[PDB]
């Protein structure tokens, strides 16, 4: 039944939250790396808490679609 | 390094304990999708996969604010 | 005579009994109500079964016991 | 429910009958001879199994 809300199927989402989740850890990762500025280094943190809220967001949005 | 003084754990540590919890949001989650419960029993299973979700990812994200600040 | 060899008073061990026929019955309904499937259905299934038969033991050991 | 015709609210009559009866039965051994209570003890097992086994048919069917 989980088909129905978007015509994609559990698969599916498995490899968009895959891809989300990825790209989230990988800008998180990013922060450890040295050599950056004071202002790079404020940014690339925006960008890890922007990706994390959509790929987090994305997980809890298949739970929630799975009633 | 600098991870290690502001937190007092390592990195490599804090990694495992949020794979951890990460590991168990998902096997909830997991059982929740193999569940014939309906009703109550099914709202309390996916209210515990989310809570314990959302520990996982407030895990990960005071991970990411203790890199420098 | 019962009270003698069992410990219990009849009223008591009816009490006793009406209980365990209740949640027998309620786990029953339970599985009527509920929208379970799978094993789960199963358990509650299995739940109403093992609650029903501890409840009739319990009458069936109540009729052993009156003697004479 | 498809499987004799009869709706649950068909059998829940069938229940108490059964389950009064066997509940009689056993309450006549609270009032008799020897072997004479004896048959009524026997009685009263018969007739408790009947309403048991159709509770549990209950439950199958469903």
Redesign the interface.
């Given at each position: 039944k989980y088909t129905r809300r978007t015509g994609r199927t559990?698969a599916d989402d498995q490899a968009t939250y895959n891809r989300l989740r990825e790209e989230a850890d990988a800008a998180?990762q990013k922060?450890?790396e040295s050599g950056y500025s004071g202002a790079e280094?404020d940014q690339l943190?925006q960008a890890?808490?922007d990706l994390?809220r959509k790929a987090?967001q994305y997980?809890?949005q298949?739970?929630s679609d799975?009633?």
């Open positions: 559990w998180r922060l450890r280094y943190r890890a808490f994390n987090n997980w809890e298949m739970l799975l009633r």
